[PDB]
């Protein structure tokens, strides 16, 4: 088993997509009026307007953690962009440094690194 | 960058965890009353009661896709367990076989295999 892909269901894929590109500092691999695909290392993240099965648009309640080499450089980048930083870089006693940012459409992202 | 951990914010971690252990046919790596950890190949899935930052408990609007060697087997196992199947095994013209299931707490899972 391999958790490979996460879809977020949203009504306005182009805007959510555009916002996610600035936050992630990479373009979508591919995007439509109703679908966008990002590759983030070994994992894909889709935005979809269509309901593949019966469900509602995404509201809240997740954190998408992205392991990065330099948390503080992402921080600076994001601050210059005007992105809402929810928790500035902090570290655990075990060396886990993280940065929590408000993403579009209720999404919350963590850019983090470990010991 | 590497997307490798997803947190779901839920209210009754032990029961959401137990429900997920049955669906995934694997035990949490670790679980307490407010937190649980799954490893699903090379990516982790946490359940969390606590709000690391401000947000609502998860409601709806994501599909978690789990790539598997045998979709039809997972199907018989899930039918046996009595888990709600949203779309029985189907296949695209490019060989992508998928099975969509209702998970706990509004979660939707897809066990899928590609050509």
mmCIF file of C-alpha atoms in Angstrom:
data_model
loop_
_atom_site.group_PDB
_atom_site.id
_atom_site.type_symbol
_atom_site.label_atom_id
_atom_site.label_comp_id
_atom_site.label_asym_id
_atom_site.label_seq_id
_atom_site.Cartn_x
_atom_site.Cartn_y
_atom_site.Cartn_z
ATOM 1 C CA UNK A 1 0.000 0.000 0.000
ATOM 2 C CA UNK A 2 1.134 3.536 -0.915
ATOM 3 C CA UNK A 3 -0.694 6.787 -0.133
ATOM 4 C CA UNK A 4 0.147 8.522 -3.401
ATOM 5 C CA UNK A 5 -2.443 11.165 -4.187
ATOM 6 C CA UNK A 6 -4.710 13.493 -2.282
ATOM 7 C CA UNK A 7 -7.617 15.286 -3.919
ATOM 8 C CA UNK A 8 -9.170 18.477 -2.556
ATOM 9 C CA UNK A 9 -12.690 19.210 -3.819
ATOM 10 C CA UNK A 10 -13.169 22.967 -4.435
ATOM 11 C CA UNK A 11 -15.576 25.115 -6.539
ATOM 12 C CA UNK A 12 -12.962 27.416 -8.063
ATOM 13 C CA UNK A 13 -10.034 25.350 -9.224
ATOM 14 C CA UNK A 14 -8.283 28.100 -11.259
ATOM 15 C CA UNK A 15 -8.062 30.474 -8.255
ATOM 16 C CA UNK A 16 -7.225 27.794 -5.699
ATOM 17 C CA UNK A 17 -4.632 26.493 -8.225
ATOM 18 C CA UNK A 18 -3.090 29.922 -8.814
ATOM 19 C CA UNK A 19 -2.866 30.526 -5.030
ATOM 20 C CA UNK A 20 -1.304 27.092 -4.379
ATOM 21 C CA UNK A 21 1.372 27.773 -7.073
ATOM 22 C CA UNK A 22 2.546 30.951 -5.263
ATOM 23 C CA UNK A 23 2.563 29.165 -1.917
ATOM 24 C CA UNK A 24 4.402 26.100 -3.224
ATOM 25 C CA UNK A 25 6.541 28.174 -5.591
ATOM 26 C CA UNK A 26 5.886 25.702 -8.409
ATOM 27 C CA UNK A 27 3.398 25.540 -11.228
ATOM 28 C CA UNK A 28 0.722 22.891 -11.561
ATOM 29 C CA UNK A 29 1.887 20.022 -13.826
ATOM 30 C CA UNK A 30 -1.456 20.447 -15.564
ATOM 31 C CA UNK A 31 -4.644 22.458 -14.966
ATOM 32 C CA UNK A 32 -8.225 22.814 -16.325
ATOM 33 C CA UNK A 33 -11.233 24.910 -15.458
ATOM 34 C CA UNK A 34 -12.083 21.996 -13.125
ATOM 35 C CA UNK A 35 -8.888 20.093 -12.316
ATOM 36 C CA UNK A 36 -5.222 20.827 -11.408
ATOM 37 C CA UNK A 37 -2.389 18.448 -10.622
ATOM 38 C CA UNK A 38 0.646 19.174 -8.545
ATOM 39 C CA UNK A 39 3.578 16.865 -7.988
ATOM 40 C CA UNK A 40 5.275 17.469 -4.639
ATOM 41 C CA UNK A 41 8.244 15.126 -4.421
ATOM 42 C CA UNK A 42 6.814 11.600 -4.192
ATOM 43 C CA UNK A 43 3.172 12.642 -3.729
ATOM 44 C CA UNK A 44 0.543 14.233 -5.995
ATOM 45 C CA UNK A 45 -2.048 16.745 -4.920
ATOM 46 C CA UNK A 46 -5.112 17.287 -7.145
ATOM 47 C CA UNK A 47 -7.746 20.023 -7.055
ATOM 48 C CA UNK A 48 -11.069 18.907 -8.462
ATOM 49 C CA UNK A 49 -14.411 20.650 -8.964
ATOM 50 C CA UNK A 50 -16.156 17.398 -9.914
ATOM 51 C CA UNK A 51 -17.560 15.095 -7.263
ATOM 52 C CA UNK A 52 -16.150 11.688 -8.094
ATOM 53 C CA UNK A 53 -18.434 10.352 -5.376
ATOM 54 C CA UNK A 54 -21.142 12.054 -3.306
ATOM 55 C CA UNK A 55 -19.419 14.566 -0.950
ATOM 56 C CA UNK A 56 -19.189 18.285 -0.153
ATOM 57 C CA UNK A 57 -16.560 20.859 -1.052
ATOM 58 C CA UNK A 58 -13.657 20.986 1.325
ATOM 59 C CA UNK A 59 -14.197 23.165 4.350
ATOM 60 C CA UNK A 60 -11.470 22.685 6.969
ATOM 61 C CA UNK A 61 -9.750 20.109 9.144
ATOM 62 C CA UNK A 62 -6.509 19.037 7.523
ATOM 63 C CA UNK A 63 -2.817 19.885 7.581
ATOM 64 C CA UNK A 64 -0.706 19.010 4.541
ATOM 65 C CA UNK A 65 2.914 18.587 5.717
ATOM 66 C CA UNK A 66 5.691 19.160 3.216
ATOM 67 C CA UNK A 67 9.214 18.152 4.119
ATOM 68 C CA UNK A 68 11.708 20.773 2.882
ATOM 69 C CA UNK A 69 15.476 21.431 3.145
ATOM 70 C CA UNK A 70 15.197 25.041 4.383
ATOM 71 C CA UNK A 71 12.188 26.127 6.458
ATOM 72 C CA UNK A 72 13.456 29.654 7.059
ATOM 73 C CA UNK A 73 14.037 30.348 3.378
ATOM 74 C CA UNK A 74 10.388 29.284 2.675
ATOM 75 C CA UNK A 75 9.391 31.586 5.511
ATOM 76 C CA UNK A 76 11.091 34.607 3.982
ATOM 77 C CA UNK A 77 9.620 33.780 0.573
ATOM 78 C CA UNK A 78 6.113 33.500 1.987
ATOM 79 C CA UNK A 79 6.371 36.694 4.106
ATOM 80 C CA UNK A 80 7.426 38.691 1.042
ATOM 81 C CA UNK A 81 4.347 37.245 -0.736
ATOM 82 C CA UNK A 82 1.926 38.338 1.983
ATOM 83 C CA UNK A 83 0.758 34.813 2.828
ATOM 84 C CA UNK A 84 -0.908 34.314 6.243
ATOM 85 C CA UNK A 85 1.613 32.655 8.528
ATOM 86 C CA UNK A 86 -0.220 30.758 11.251
ATOM 87 C CA UNK A 87 2.872 29.713 13.299
ATOM 88 C CA UNK A 88 6.344 31.200 12.413
ATOM 89 C CA UNK A 89 9.274 28.841 12.319
ATOM 90 C CA UNK A 90 9.545 26.905 15.576
ATOM 91 C CA UNK A 91 11.429 23.791 16.591
ATOM 92 C CA UNK A 92 10.745 20.849 18.862
ATOM 93 C CA UNK A 93 13.297 19.629 21.368
ATOM 94 C CA UNK A 94 13.987 16.809 18.838
ATOM 95 C CA UNK A 95 14.917 19.240 16.064
ATOM 96 C CA UNK A 96 11.685 19.285 14.100
ATOM 97 C CA UNK A 97 11.422 22.759 12.699
ATOM 98 C CA UNK A 98 8.071 23.785 11.207
ATOM 99 C CA UNK A 99 6.191 26.676 9.637
ATOM 100 C CA UNK A 100 2.399 26.639 9.409
ATOM 101 C CA UNK A 101 0.734 28.689 6.678
ATOM 102 C CA UNK A 102 -2.858 29.399 5.687
ATOM 103 C CA UNK A 103 -3.458 27.919 2.241
ATOM 104 C CA UNK A 104 -6.453 28.735 -0.035
ATOM 105 C CA UNK A 105 -9.924 27.203 0.508
ATOM 106 C CA UNK A 106 -9.450 26.361 4.180
ATOM 107 C CA UNK A 107 -6.198 24.379 3.518
ATOM 108 C CA UNK A 108 -3.350 24.617 6.031
ATOM 109 C CA UNK A 109 0.198 23.745 4.998
ATOM 110 C CA UNK A 110 3.236 22.871 7.094
ATOM 111 C CA UNK A 111 6.710 23.308 5.640
ATOM 112 C CA UNK A 112 8.928 21.271 7.997
ATOM 113 C CA UNK A 113 12.308 19.534 8.455
ATOM 114 C CA UNK A 114 13.638 17.032 10.966
ATOM 115 C CA UNK A 115 16.916 16.217 12.908
ATOM 116 C CA UNK B 1 9.903 19.443 -1.331
ATOM 117 C CA UNK B 2 8.130 16.243 -0.250
ATOM 118 C CA UNK B 3 4.484 15.854 0.664
ATOM 119 C CA UNK B 4 4.686 12.938 3.240
ATOM 120 C CA UNK B 5 2.265 13.500 6.129
ATOM 121 C CA UNK B 6 -1.422 14.298 6.146
ATOM 122 C CA UNK B 7 -3.277 15.186 9.344
ATOM 123 C CA UNK B 8 -7.013 14.784 9.717
ATOM 124 C CA UNK B 9 -8.515 16.828 12.568
ATOM 125 C CA UNK B 10 -11.324 14.746 14.141
ATOM 126 C CA UNK B 11 -13.235 14.609 17.433
ATOM 127 C CA UNK B 12 -13.101 10.873 18.471
ATOM 128 C CA UNK B 13 -9.625 9.719 17.589
ATOM 129 C CA UNK B 14 -9.874 6.219 19.114
ATOM 130 C CA UNK B 15 -13.017 5.318 17.145
ATOM 131 C CA UNK B 16 -11.888 7.023 13.885
ATOM 132 C CA UNK B 17 -8.577 5.176 14.345
ATOM 133 C CA UNK B 18 -10.300 1.815 14.905
ATOM 134 C CA UNK B 19 -12.533 2.368 11.876
ATOM 135 C CA UNK B 20 -9.423 3.214 9.761
ATOM 136 C CA UNK B 21 -7.469 0.167 11.010
ATOM 137 C CA UNK B 22 -10.295 -2.038 9.660
ATOM 138 C CA UNK B 23 -10.520 -0.267 6.296
ATOM 139 C CA UNK B 24 -6.730 -0.297 5.807
ATOM 140 C CA UNK B 25 -6.395 -3.761 7.314
ATOM 141 C CA UNK B 26 -3.485 -2.391 9.312
ATOM 142 C CA UNK B 27 -2.938 -1.120 12.813
ATOM 143 C CA UNK B 28 -1.933 2.373 13.789
ATOM 144 C CA UNK B 29 1.849 2.587 14.464
ATOM 145 C CA UNK B 30 0.852 4.476 17.563
ATOM 146 C CA UNK B 31 -2.341 5.932 19.052
ATOM 147 C CA UNK B 32 -3.435 7.657 22.192
ATOM 148 C CA UNK B 33 -6.694 9.357 23.145
ATOM 149 C CA UNK B 34 -6.006 12.431 20.944
ATOM 150 C CA UNK B 35 -3.626 11.229 18.266
ATOM 151 C CA UNK B 36 -2.985 8.297 15.958
ATOM 152 C CA UNK B 37 -0.318 7.530 13.351
ATOM 153 C CA UNK B 38 -0.543 5.327 10.309
ATOM 154 C CA UNK B 39 2.267 4.615 7.921
ATOM 155 C CA UNK B 40 0.900 3.864 4.448
ATOM 156 C CA UNK B 41 3.989 2.944 2.474
ATOM 157 C CA UNK B 42 6.193 6.025 2.265
ATOM 158 C CA UNK B 43 3.630 8.504 3.566
ATOM 159 C CA UNK B 44 2.000 9.015 6.971
ATOM 160 C CA UNK B 45 -1.599 9.712 7.942
ATOM 161 C CA UNK B 46 -2.311 11.208 11.334
ATOM 162 C CA UNK B 47 -5.564 11.673 13.187
ATOM 163 C CA UNK B 48 -5.489 14.503 15.621
ATOM 164 C CA UNK B 49 -7.917 15.903 18.156
ATOM 165 C CA UNK B 50 -5.771 18.936 18.907
ATOM 166 C CA UNK B 51 -5.769 22.033 16.730
ATOM 167 C CA UNK B 52 -2.060 22.744 16.118
ATOM 168 C CA UNK B 53 -3.374 26.003 14.592
ATOM 169 C CA UNK B 54 -6.967 27.328 14.338
ATOM 170 C CA UNK B 55 -9.386 25.345 12.072
ATOM 171 C CA UNK B 56 -12.680 23.252 12.193
ATOM 172 C CA UNK B 57 -12.707 19.463 12.584
ATOM 173 C CA UNK B 58 -12.510 17.771 9.180
ATOM 174 C CA UNK B 59 -15.930 17.583 7.446
ATOM 175 C CA UNK B 60 -15.796 16.497 3.774
ATOM 176 C CA UNK B 61 -14.121 17.216 0.473
ATOM 177 C CA UNK B 62 -11.006 15.040 0.111
ATOM 178 C CA UNK B 63 -10.200 11.680 -1.460
ATOM 179 C CA UNK B 64 -7.152 9.840 -0.087
ATOM 180 C CA UNK B 65 -5.758 7.531 -2.810
ATOM 181 C CA UNK B 66 -3.901 4.401 -1.822
ATOM 182 C CA UNK B 67 -2.045 2.561 -4.580
ATOM 183 C CA UNK B 68 -2.337 -1.207 -4.189
ATOM 184 C CA UNK B 69 -1.244 -4.391 -5.984
ATOM 185 C CA UNK B 70 -4.714 -5.971 -5.853
ATOM 186 C CA UNK B 71 -7.849 -3.813 -5.890
ATOM 187 C CA UNK B 72 -10.344 -6.697 -6.284
ATOM 188 C CA UNK B 73 -9.019 -8.483 -3.188
ATOM 189 C CA UNK B 74 -9.384 -5.255 -1.141
ATOM 190 C CA UNK B 75 -12.893 -5.138 -2.538
ATOM 191 C CA UNK B 76 -13.901 -8.605 -1.252
ATOM 192 C CA UNK B 77 -12.298 -7.826 2.179
ATOM 193 C CA UNK B 78 -14.225 -4.499 2.371
ATOM 194 C CA UNK B 79 -17.552 -6.094 1.224
ATOM 195 C CA UNK B 80 -17.057 -8.747 3.909
ATOM 196 C CA UNK B 81 -16.392 -6.085 6.594
ATOM 197 C CA UNK B 82 -19.613 -4.391 5.463
ATOM 198 C CA UNK B 83 -17.835 -1.138 4.625
ATOM 199 C CA UNK B 84 -19.814 1.182 2.273
ATOM 200 C CA UNK B 85 -18.387 0.993 -1.273
ATOM 201 C CA UNK B 86 -19.088 4.132 -3.269
ATOM 202 C CA UNK B 87 -17.967 2.731 -6.674
ATOM 203 C CA UNK B 88 -17.185 -1.013 -7.047
ATOM 204 C CA UNK B 89 -14.000 -1.851 -8.926
ATOM 205 C CA UNK B 90 -13.931 0.036 -12.238
ATOM 206 C CA UNK B 91 -11.118 0.647 -14.744
ATOM 207 C CA UNK B 92 -10.248 3.488 -17.103
ATOM 208 C CA UNK B 93 -9.279 2.863 -20.710
ATOM 209 C CA UNK B 94 -5.643 3.424 -19.698
ATOM 210 C CA UNK B 95 -5.758 0.576 -17.151
ATOM 211 C CA UNK B 96 -6.292 2.534 -13.886
ATOM 212 C CA UNK B 97 -8.424 0.302 -11.697
ATOM 213 C CA UNK B 98 -10.054 1.964 -8.716
ATOM 214 C CA UNK B 99 -12.342 1.303 -5.726
ATOM 215 C CA UNK B 100 -13.928 4.201 -3.817
ATOM 216 C CA UNK B 101 -15.045 3.616 -0.261
ATOM 217 C CA UNK B 102 -16.744 5.602 2.480
ATOM 218 C CA UNK B 103 -14.273 6.030 5.354
ATOM 219 C CA UNK B 104 -15.019 7.356 8.863
ATOM 220 C CA UNK B 105 -15.549 11.029 9.699
ATOM 221 C CA UNK B 106 -16.539 12.031 6.138
ATOM 222 C CA UNK B 107 -13.318 10.585 4.664
ATOM 223 C CA UNK B 108 -13.320 8.973 1.222
ATOM 224 C CA UNK B 109 -10.628 6.483 0.264
ATOM 225 C CA UNK B 110 -9.642 5.127 -3.140
ATOM 226 C CA UNK B 111 -7.670 1.888 -3.402
ATOM 227 C CA UNK B 112 -6.295 1.940 -6.954
ATOM 228 C CA UNK B 113 -3.886 0.214 -9.374
ATOM 229 C CA UNK B 114 -2.498 1.664 -12.613
ATOM 230 C CA UNK B 115 -1.609 -0.081 -15.905
#
